[PDB]
Amino acid sequence: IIGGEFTTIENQPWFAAIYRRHRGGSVTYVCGGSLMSPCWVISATHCFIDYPKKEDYIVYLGRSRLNSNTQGEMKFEVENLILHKDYSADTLAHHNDIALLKIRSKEGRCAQPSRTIQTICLPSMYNDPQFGTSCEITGFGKEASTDYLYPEQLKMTVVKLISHRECQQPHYYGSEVTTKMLCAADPQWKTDSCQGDSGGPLVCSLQGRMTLTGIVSWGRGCALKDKPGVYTRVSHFLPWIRSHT
């Protein structure tokens, strides 16, 4: 996240950290995710696209740090990895960028509710906040697009949603952004999501609830003027999520 503040998982207890194991002894961070129900985590397809071997990923819940433990954390295996059929990538955007991971603990269970582990809510059919709403994104992504490592402490920031009219202006992203995407920026382009934040949540309040409105997907650079962050519009995928969960 560029800008933002450092936080702990108590402030984002639905955030999931997804890592990949390597035949060598190392485990590396991949992308972030969110818990929808006790056994399901949601993220982005482009995070798995190149190595869709479920057996090699580990998911941790209740994690405030990247490579050190947090007490109360849970580790899971991906029992199912569902990527989107119709997932495309162009010279910038990713279309249908949503994925589902069913988790299983080494004891046969799914997530258990705690002060560091909670689920986040889904919107209702094509229901989103109005542009202007301030939402928060969270994650371990880069703190500057030129860095090459990720932070060790969880971060968070608040960004606002903008309209498609504004995001599809030629000097922004033109028609690379579609109605199944949402754009969010800082009025003064100071904070934004960045590489390493993909799959993670864009939460906003809707009808009283903290709802998962978007999933970090792409963006040109990080915190660049007139280059908003683009997210997957969760409210447009409800049918899809449903047919699988």
Partner: peptide, 9 residues
Amino acid sequence: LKFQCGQKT
């Protein structure tokens, strides 16, 4: 106790 989506404690 049980999950309550959206809640922080």
